Amino acid sequence: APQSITELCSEYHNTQIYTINDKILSYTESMAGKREMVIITFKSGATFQVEVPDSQKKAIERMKDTLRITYLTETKIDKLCVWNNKTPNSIAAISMEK
Amino acid sequence: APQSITELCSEYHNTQIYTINDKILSYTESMAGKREMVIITFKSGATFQVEVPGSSQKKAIERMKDTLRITYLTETKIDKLCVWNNKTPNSIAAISMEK
Amino acid sequence: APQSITELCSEYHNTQIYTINDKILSYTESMAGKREMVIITFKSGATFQVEVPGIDSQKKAIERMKDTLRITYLTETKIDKLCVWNNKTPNSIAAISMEK
Amino acid sequence: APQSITELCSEYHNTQIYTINDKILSYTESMAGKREMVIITFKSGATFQVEVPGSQHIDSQKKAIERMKDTLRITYLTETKIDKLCVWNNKTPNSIAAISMEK
Amino acid sequence: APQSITELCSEYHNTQIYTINDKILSYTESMAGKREMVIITFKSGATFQVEVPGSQHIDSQKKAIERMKDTLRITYLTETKIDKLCVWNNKTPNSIAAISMEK
Ligand SMILES: CC(=O)N[C@H]1[C@@H](O[C@H]2[C@@H](O)[C@@H](CO)O[C@@H](O[C@H]3[C@H](O[C@@H]4O[C@@H](C)[C@@H](O)[C@@H](O)[C@@H]4O)[C@@H](O)[C@H](O)O[C@@H]3CO)[C@@H]2O[C@@H]2O[C@@H](C)[C@@H](O)[C@@H](O)[C@@H]2O)O[C@H](CO)[C@H](O)[C@@H]1O
Ligand SMILES: CC(=O)N[C@H]1[C@@H](O[C@H]2[C@@H](O)[C@@H](CO)O[C@@H](O[C@H]3[C@H](O[C@@H]4O[C@@H](C)[C@@H](O)[C@@H](O)[C@@H]4O)[C@@H](O)[C@H](O)O[C@@H]3CO)[C@@H]2O[C@@H]2O[C@@H](C)[C@@H](O)[C@@H](O)[C@@H]2O)O[C@H](CO)[C@H](O)[C@@H]1O
Ligand SMILES: CC(=O)N[C@H]1[C@@H](O[C@H]2[C@@H](O)[C@@H](CO)O[C@@H](O[C@H]3[C@H](O[C@@H]4O[C@@H](C)[C@@H](O)[C@@H](O)[C@@H]4O)[C@@H](O)[C@H](O)O[C@@H]3CO)[C@@H]2O[C@@H]2O[C@@H](C)[C@@H](O)[C@@H](O)[C@@H]2O)O[C@H](CO)[C@H](O)[C@@H]1O
Ligand SMILES: CC(=O)N[C@H]1[C@@H](O[C@H]2[C@@H](O)[C@@H](CO)O[C@@H](O[C@H]3[C@H](O[C@@H]4O[C@@H](C)[C@@H](O)[C@@H](O)[C@@H]4O)[C@@H](O)[C@H](O)O[C@@H]3CO)[C@@H]2O[C@@H]2O[C@@H](C)[C@@H](O)[C@@H](O)[C@@H]2O)O[C@H](CO)[C@H](O)[C@@H]1O
Numbered sequence: 001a002p003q004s005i006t007e008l009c010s011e012y013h014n015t016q017i018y019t020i021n022d023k024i025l026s027y028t029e030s031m032a033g034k035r036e037m038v039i040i041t042f043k044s045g046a047t048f049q050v051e052v053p054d055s056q057k058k059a060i061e062r063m064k065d066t067l068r069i070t071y072l073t074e075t076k077i078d079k080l081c082v083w084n085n086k087t088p089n090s091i092a093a094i095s096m097e098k
Numbered sequence: 099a100p101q102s103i104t105e106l107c108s109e110y111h112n113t114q115i116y117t118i119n120d121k122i123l124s125y126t127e128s129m130a131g132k133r134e135m136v137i138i139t140f141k142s143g144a145t146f147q148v149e150v151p152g153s154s155q156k157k158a159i160e161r162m163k164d165t166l167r168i169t170y171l172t173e174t175k176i177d178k179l180c181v182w183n184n185k186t187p188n189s190i191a192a193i194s195m196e197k
Numbered sequence: 198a199p200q201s202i203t204e205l206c207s208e209y210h211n212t213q214i215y216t217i218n219d220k221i222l223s224y225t226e227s228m229a230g231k232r233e234m235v236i237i238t239f240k241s242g243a244t245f246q247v248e249v250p251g252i253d254s255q256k257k258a259i260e261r262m263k264d265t266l267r268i269t270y271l272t273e274t275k276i277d278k279l280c281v282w283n284n285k286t287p288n289s290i291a292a293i294s295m296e297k
Numbered sequence: 298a299p300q301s302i303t304e305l306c307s308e309y310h311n312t313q314i315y316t317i318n319d320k321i322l323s324y325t326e327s328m329a330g331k332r333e334m335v336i337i338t339f340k341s342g343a344t345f346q347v348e349v350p351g352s353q354h355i356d357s358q359k360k361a362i363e364r365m366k367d368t369l370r371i372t373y374l375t376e377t378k379i380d381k382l383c384v385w386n387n388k389t390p391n392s393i394a395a396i397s398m399e400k
Numbered sequence: 401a402p403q404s405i406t407e408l409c410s411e412y413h414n415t416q417i418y419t420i421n422d423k424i425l426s427y428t429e430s431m432a433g434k435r436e437m438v439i440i441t442f443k444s445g446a447t448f449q450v451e452v453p454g455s456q457h458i459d460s461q462k463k464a465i466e467r468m469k470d471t472l473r474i475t476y477l478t479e480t481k482i483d484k485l486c487v488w489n490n491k492t493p494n495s496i497a498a499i500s501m502e503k
């Protein structure tokens with residue numbers, strides 16, 4: 001199994017790593033029908049989503065949990081692995097340090 | 099998909115954006131039958147619910163209630179709410195926070 | 198829908214509103230068989246439960262209420278009011294409101 | 298219903314109240330097959346477990362077991378002072394039935 | 401039941417105890433399909449995973465995997481010192497079976 005976000009990311013098609021190296025500027029969360037999604041934003045101008053939604057179901061909910069608490073604690077994100085065939089780019093993985 | 103709360107809100111009928119720019123004044127939570135809901139309040143005088151589940155959105159209602167609770171307790175400044183205004187109190191569809 | 202804990206409370210029989218205006222003094226949680234409950238306590242001497250499960254909507258709510266009491270206790274968050282069923286010993290929590 | 302941990306404890310066979318009046322010294326959590334459990338420790342020398350869910354447990358206890366493990370983790374992380382533990386003492390380590398905290 | 405992480409580690413095959421006595425350096429989490437996993441990293445050079453749920457996991461492990469990942473995240477965010485890890489050493493990276501923290 002991969003031992004880093006970059007390794008994991010290189011396994012998938014239509015992905016790229018973003019080096020964020022920053023805390024989340026804004027956190028948006030919606031329960032509107034067909035837009036049950038999370039949107040985060042950075043002062044870089046970068047916008048990301050956790051897409052509207054079976055072990056992936058639990059993982060999707062975990063990701064949204066992680067982004068929320070990461071925003072609330074002002075935790076510095078190292079990288080994001082995102083799918084770049086979506087607008088905004090959809091999050092596949094997150095890494096944080098230190 | 100939408101890239102902001104304002105864009106998301108615009109996709110829907112009977113919605114409006116409230117600018118809060120404030121922390122939540124009060125959090126109310128009920129487990130009473132037929133009223134399994136949260137109610138939040140602001141010093142502006144605004145009152146909103148997350149509304150009782152009824153006829154993918156089920157986990158989202160739960161997440162919103164989660165978010166509002168931790169937001170209240172940490173006194174986190176809410177930016178905007180997107181709400182349905184065909185209900186009283188207005189029902190939350192989306193929330194945004196900026197740091 | 199109701200707009201406050203007081204309005205909500207007045208929709209049900211065998212309820213009343215206690216004005217707590219204080220943090221939780223003690224938190225007790227049990228996983229014993231048929232006593233899967235939370236008990237909370239205040240300086241006033243008041244004692245309340247989240248009572249053992251008997252609707253499908255309510256099961257998720259009972260669990261949330263217990264989550265809420267726990268973190269309310271750990272953060273020393275002032276409870277404004279409790280809406281409670283007074284046909285139980287101790288009184289059983291239907292709703293909670295929090296404001297400083 | 299019982300109105301205190303002591304009252305509740307007295308309702309079951311093979312239980313006692315350990316008065317702890319201290320924070321958790323160590324939290325141990327396992328996802329190893331058939332030992333999906335939590336062990337907690339105090340500087341008194343006390344070791345306790347939340348038992349693995351099994352045939353001795355009724356359906357209603359399953360969500361409660363998960364809750365108790367939640368509480369112990371957050372209790373450990375926050376250095377929250379535990380007042381009493383109600384434990385079953387026919388297990389090794391003693392098994393947590395209930396916990397109480399006072400501020 | 402075992403009364404410590406080392407005792408627990410000794411009930412299983414293909415396990416070893418890593419003594420960390422350190423907070424987590426990095427936390428990585430993925431919802432990518434077939435890689436629904438968490439990876440953690442320490443200053444010592446060590447790397448660990450909580451592996452994707454799979455056929456090798458029994459049904460009681462499913463909630464424990466989710467819990468282990470909940471624990472690691474919050475451990476990372478609070479900078480809480482991890483004492484020991486019980487890891488399966490027949491996976492790369494080593495897979496977490498148990499965790500202990502002490503202060
Ligand atoms: C309001 C807000 O936060 N964002 C809105 C904004 O976002 C785009 C802009 O910020 C531009 C900068 O001109 O960058 C777009 O991203 C590029 C990306 O650029 C690189 O990363 C960004 C963050 C900057 O640092 C650039 O200097 C970098 O070159 C390219 O590498 C990538 O290949 O293509 C996208 C172009 O789409 C921002 O787009 C958003 O964020 C990125 C990460 C994607 O997820 C994309 O889908 C998002 O839309 O402007 C857009 C409209 O263009 C929206 O209004 C955003 O809300
Ligand atoms: C005490 C308390 O918190 N809430 C009770 C109160 O709520 C209403 C009042 O706060 C009035 C004051 O004018 O505004 C209502 O909202 C209006 C809204 O007003 C605008 O926004 C509020 C926050 C204020 O800042 C106003 O000055 C603004 O003009 C209008 O713009 C909107 O179009 O219509 C509503 C009323 O229909 C408050 O209503 C509550 O909160 C809003 C956001 C909705 O969710 C609404 O459904 C709520 O009722 O009075 C009401 C009864 O009028 C209840 O007793 C509340 O509990
Ligand atoms: C030790 C402890 O915390 N509780 C034990 C105690 O609890 C009862 C006492 O604290 C008495 C003291 O008068 O009050 C009971 O509550 C009354 C209630 O009194 C009013 O509210 C409380 C908060 C106090 O402020 C009183 O001074 C107030 O006047 C009345 O409002 C109500 O009509 O009647 C109840 C019960 O008669 C305490 O009862 C407990 O808490 C209340 C809120 C209910 O949930 C009730 O069911 C509880 O038993 O004594 C009991 C046994 O009587 C147990 O030993 C508690 O552990
Ligand atoms: C390493 C560690 O933390 N614990 C290991 C230890 O645990 C036992 C010791 O701490 C002995 C010391 O004699 O006490 C055992 O508990 C007794 C209990 O003793 C009293 O309470 C403890 C907490 C201390 O304060 C003692 O000084 C007190 O005398 C007796 O009162 C009771 O009647 O019987 C128990 C034993 O059953 C400790 O046992 C552990 O903790 C208790 C609370 C139970 O849950 C028990 O099952 C635990 O084993 O030694 C054991 C060896 O079996 C393990 O190595 C522990 O990990």
Ligand SMILES: CC(=O)N[C@H]1[C@@H](O[C@H]2[C@@H](O)[C@@H](CO)O[C@@H](O[C@H]3[C@H](O[C@@H]4O[C@@H](C)[C@@H](O)[C@@H](O)[C@@H]4O)[C@@H](O)[C@H](O)O[C@@H]3CO)[C@@H]2O[C@@H]2O[C@@H](C)[C@@H](O)[C@@H](O)[C@@H]2O)O[C@H](CO)[C@H](O)[C@@H]1O
Pocket residue numbers: 003004441442444445446447448491492493494495
């Ligand atoms: C970037 C990063 O953090 N880690 C990458 C790194 O990890 C390996 C290295 O850090 C080497 C350094 O020699 O150690 C490997 O672990 C050994 C282990 O060594 C002992 O533990 C480490 C942490 C050090 O403190 C050593 O001094 C200790 O002696 C031996 O005990 C064990 O028998 O064998 C492994 C060799 O695989 C690190 O391996 C990673 O972490 C361990 C715990 C396993 O989980 C393993 O699967 C991991 O790969 O290099 C590897 C690839 O070589 C990856 O890129 C890591 O991400």
